Amino acid sequence: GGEIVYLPNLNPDQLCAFIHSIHDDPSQSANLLAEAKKLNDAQA
Amino acid sequence: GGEIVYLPNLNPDQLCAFIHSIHDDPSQSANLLAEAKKLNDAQA
Amino acid sequence: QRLANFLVHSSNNFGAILSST
């Protein structure tokens, strides 16, 4: 809660699903944030 | 140069559109997030 | 709940940040 999670390495289509996932399950939000971060870190 | 704008008032689909427009039109990015700033402003 | 505020460094990089408190 309050950490900065940059994912500019995500491609629009992929992060699009991530955003829609946060909307669909805001409970898992942080973990979905941590999830997408795996690709962000990979393409980093 | 380059401010860090927080726009949380956007729609999930709006982010999908905006981000897609950044990677697709990176030269226009300045304008695309210009909109986003008014976008989150309108739904604030 | 917990949500992610969407911030972006205008020049090249868009990111996220969580927000609850």
Technique that determined the structure: NMR
> Do the Cβ atoms of A12 and B12 come within 8 Å?
no
Domains of chain A: residue spans and CATH: 1-44 (1.20.5.420)
Residue A38: C-alpha distances to residues A17, A34, B1, B25 (Å): 14, 7, 29, 25
Contact residues, chain C to chain A, C-beta under 8 Å: 1-4, 7, 12-21
For residue A8, how many other CB atoms are within 10 A of its CB?
18
What is the Cβ-side half-sphere exposure of residue C15, based on CA atoms within 13 angstroms? Answer: 19
Question: Which long-range contacts does B20-25 make (Cβ < 8 Å, 24+ apart)?
Answer: B20/A12, B20/A13, B20/A16, B22/A12, B22/C14, B23/A11, B23/A12, B24/A12
- A13-41 in b/e form (b: 16+ CB < 10 A) is eebbebbebbeeeeeebbebbeebbebbe
A10: left (phi over 0), alpha (psi -120 to 50) or beta: beta
Strands (E) in A3-42, as ranges, are 4-6
Compare CB distances from A2 to C14, C15, C19 and report the shortest one's residue: C19
